[PDB]
Amino acid sequence: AIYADNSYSIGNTPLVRLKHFGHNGNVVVKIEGRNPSYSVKCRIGANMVWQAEKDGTLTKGKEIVDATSGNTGIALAYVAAARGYKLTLTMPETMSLERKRLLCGLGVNLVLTEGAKGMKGAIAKAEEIVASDPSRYVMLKQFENPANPQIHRETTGPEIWKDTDGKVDVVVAGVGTGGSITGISRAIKLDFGKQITSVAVEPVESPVISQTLAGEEVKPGPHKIQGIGAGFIPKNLDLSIIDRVETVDSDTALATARRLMAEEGILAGISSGAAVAAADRLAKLPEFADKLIVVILPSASERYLSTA
């Protein structure tokens, strides 16, 4: 019951019942902060590295690339260090010193990009080192990599089934890559065969999924719900297993995160506040009265600035 390295130590994260949200305790949270690296992305972080090894696109001598300096950047950084790979992360020069020092604390070869450029000054940059030796660099692409939802289908989803004794009725999750809701949803509906309700959450400000589903014009915008609302349909979001889409604004998300800390004693990130707020909305519909709703809390406070 000892792990060979920190990557193997992912998951078995806890389910806590909320007291000041939902109705007669129908809203239960999954705490994704309780992982190495301290985000939901630890899971994919391990398994995208495991997978590239297993199929042999990763080997002693290949060094990893991406431009995510978000939770997946930290995930990959921890796993790379645990497992002997050197990591390069692209990232505009516009970023925070503390993530620049979290990652340089993790042994990332950070590659400062352009504050005239953003995530193009990054995305396209990473590629160029992938280009300058495509037998050297290898880039994992969390937005389209199947090893992303696969891990969720084989860990996140089952842990929920088991913890709940197959009682779970609804699952609520914010969408970045889509891998959580996709893997979770496939586990419960396909491997177990229970016809639950899958709710994706997206910002009202950048509501590209609803817009797509309604055959409207896709119109992304800025928000503050860090970790979700990419502004496009990720290839890792299986639109097929998605029953419902709830939108949430930045203020409410932000306020719901403060409430979680101060009322529930739960150290929630901003995305976590988004997902709860939408679960609560469903939770207070007579239609989901007698229904056990599980919410993903992807990250922990302290990584944050919901503290104004």
Partner: peptide, 7 residues
């Protein structure tokens, strides 16, 4: 230069 793409 998509900010909310850095997940």
């Amino acid at each position: 230069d998509g900010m909310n793409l850095n997940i």
